[PDB]
Amino acid sequence: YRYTGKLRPHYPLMPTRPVPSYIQRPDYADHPLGMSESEQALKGTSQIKLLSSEDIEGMRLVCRLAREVLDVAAGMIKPGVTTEEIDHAVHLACIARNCYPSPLNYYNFPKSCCTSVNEVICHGIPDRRPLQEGDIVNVDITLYRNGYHGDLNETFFVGEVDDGARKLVQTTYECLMQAIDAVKPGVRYRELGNIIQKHAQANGFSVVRSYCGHGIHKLFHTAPNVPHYAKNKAVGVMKSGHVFTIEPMICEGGWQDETWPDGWTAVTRDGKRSAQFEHTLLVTDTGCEILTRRLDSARPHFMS
Ligand SMILES: CC(C)(C)OC(=O)Nc1cccnc1C(=O)Nc1nccs1
Ligand SMILES: [Ca+2]
Numbered sequence: 001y002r003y004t005g006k007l008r009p010h011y012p013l014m015p016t017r018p019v020p021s022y023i024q025r026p027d028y029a030d031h032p033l034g035m036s037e038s039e040q041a042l043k044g045t046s047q048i049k050l051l052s053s054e055d056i057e058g059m060r061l062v063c064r065l066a067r068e069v070l071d072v073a074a075g076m077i078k079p080g081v082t083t084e085e086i087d088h089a090v091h092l093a094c095i096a097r098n099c100y101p102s103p104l105n106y107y108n109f110p111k112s113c114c115t116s117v118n119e120v121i122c123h124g125i126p127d128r129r130p131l132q133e134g135d136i137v138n139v140d141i142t143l144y145r146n147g148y149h150g151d152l153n154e155t156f157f158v159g160e161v162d163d164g165a166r167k168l169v170q171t172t173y174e175c176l177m178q179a180i181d182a183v184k185p186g187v188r189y190r191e192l193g194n195i196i197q198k199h200a201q202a203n204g205f206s207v208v209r210s211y212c213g214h215g216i217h218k219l220f221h222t223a224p225n226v227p228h229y230a231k232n233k234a235v236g237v238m239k240s241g242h243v244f245t246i247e248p249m250i251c252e253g254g255w256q257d258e259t260w261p262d263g264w265t266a267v268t269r270d271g272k273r274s275a276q277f278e279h280t281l282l283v284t285d286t287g288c289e290i291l292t293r294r295l296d297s298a299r300p301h302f303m304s
């Protein structure tokens, strides 16, 4: 395999971390290949679930807990810390909140969160590499509690970063918020990509096309599929009660991605940097509730 940039995986990986049996597990947690039968049963369907008041309370809870766990990871970002150490802290923080870390064994993913450094677009696997000053790193968190999944992610700066890193991260966050500001009943899911690409393009950045936002609730990834690029064929119109994520991955260079031999790590084909931000949103009668928002601080960590 020919690596696209300077990053290399740092093996060996620690043995998979167990989750106490008292914590409720999603169906794929105990499937040998990590397959989710409940999810697969709806593969290819575009119908979007309309959450009940009960489902909404469950989503509000898990999303708040997920934010708490991402905040824990945020506090650990510093030069010298390995992504496996961040993952260990996330795993324990999920357990402390009586939640199962959704990524764990999802289609056999080996860790409890995704840590994506520099040219890694997404799905980076926590390993032995210590973070380096100047790096940008995304931590993607998803928790499962009482049958509901809550998902969010932020990109962080490791020590002092260059102006290019600052612009990429700020722009990506702005792309996400402009999309969220457009969410309300009656809006087509395909419009979000037009908004995101317009802002990214105005700043000289590209939009990853192989990975999209997704419906999330009783399932980790389900309808609707939400592309972040312009002129996409996303199916569906927003309605109060819909819950889904917006998680644009923006790149310094081209939008093309490829996957490492580990089967998970997605990287830019040109080796340039990529940044991402994500929130889980609930469409209300008039707009949307950002379930994974910070409740005690006005801004994301990179600008805090
Ligand atoms: C094909 C199938 C199984 C339903 O998975 C997905 O679509 N998956 C998906 C879509 C968009 C963004 N992400 C993912 C994903 O897995 N991300 C993960 N994060 C941690 C472990 S797996
Ligand atoms: Ca990255």
Ligand SMILES: [Co+2]
Binding pocket: 122, 123
């Ligand atoms: Co993902």
Ligand SMILES: [Co+2]
Binding pocket: 140, 141, 142, 151, 152, 153, 247, 278
């Ligand atoms: Co996520």
Ligand SMILES: [Co+2]
Binding pocket: 151, 152, 213, 214, 245, 247, 278
């Ligand atoms: Co997501």
